[PDB]
Amino acid sequence: RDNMASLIQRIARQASLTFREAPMQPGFPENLSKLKSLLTQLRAEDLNIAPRKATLQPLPPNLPPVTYMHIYETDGFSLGVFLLKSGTSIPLHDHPGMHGMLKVLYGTVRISCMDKLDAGGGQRPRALPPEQQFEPPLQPREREAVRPGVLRSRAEYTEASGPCILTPHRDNLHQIDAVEGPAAFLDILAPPYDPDDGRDCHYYRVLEPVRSDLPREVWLLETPQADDFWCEGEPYPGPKVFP
Ligand code: NI
């Protein structure tokens, strides 16, 4: 095709149309599928990002385990790249009210996908039974705050994998582990997080009871952002999204 914009410009345009008369323009399901088709095509070289290797030395507290390249954002969506060093994870977290789509650029990530049980989805979340104990033991305040959940999947993804999609009510919690070296992925979220307006990134831990196939029910506890987890910016080297 002549006169085609960069792939990342086209992804940004499509995300904007997806998330925000005659002839009728596409609706949301068509737009989301087109967005997924564009992400399926995206390669690290399309963003001028070369695959990284050999984060050879142990990671001191001075250095961020994960870095972030900002590409674009509107009120409707955010668009950027997360780059995980060898042996690091983005800990389990949610995306309140949000859709998400990500695409691995290089390396391998294990993505564990979960949900809190939602009575709007025909579930009946129970309270933690009193005789239920965990390792480490739960403070009584924590017992009241435990949420039943479901661990749906825990697969490994590479650049060959299709994009990974989440919705407000399905696969809305995920953890992302870098497997066998550094890894990176492009992430689209809609709407973007907004701490100032009560749309936060919440972290969770899965509790380990005292006394196995997926899906399986789990107990979840909201937890602060881990002391050793942070994610600082670095320059984005790819084609610029205009304006
Ligand atoms: Ni996420």
Author numbering: 3 to 22, 40 to 230, 239 to 270
Paper's wording?
Cysteamine dioxygenase (ADO) plays a vital role in regulating thiol metabolism and preserving oxygen homeostasis in humans by oxidizing the sulfur of cysteamine and N-terminal cysteine-containing proteins to their corresponding sulfinic acids using O2 as a cosubstrate. Among all thiol dioxygenases, ADO stands out for its broader spectrum of substrates. It is the only enzyme of this protein family that oxidizes both small-molecule and protein substrates. Hence, in addition to regulating thiol metabolism, ADO initiates a transduction cascade, signaling hypoxia and preserving oxygen homeostasis in humans. pmcThiol dioxygenases constitute a family of nonheme iron enzymes containing a ferrous iron center coordinated by three histidine residues.
Herein, we report the first crystal structure of human ADO at a resolution of 1.78 Å with a nickel-bound metal center. Crystallization was achieved through both metal substitution and C18S/C239S double mutations. In order to obtain hADO with a homogeneous metal center and prevent oxidation via the iron center, hADO cell culture was grown with minimal media supplemented with NiSO4 during induction of hADO expression. Despite the flexibility, the core of the hADO structure is a “jelly roll” β-barrel that supports a catalytic center. The metal center of ADO sits in a tunnel formed by the β-barrel. Instead, residues 137–144 of Loop 4 intrude into the catalytic center of an adjacent, crystallographic symmetry-related molecule, forming interactions with residues at the active site entrance.
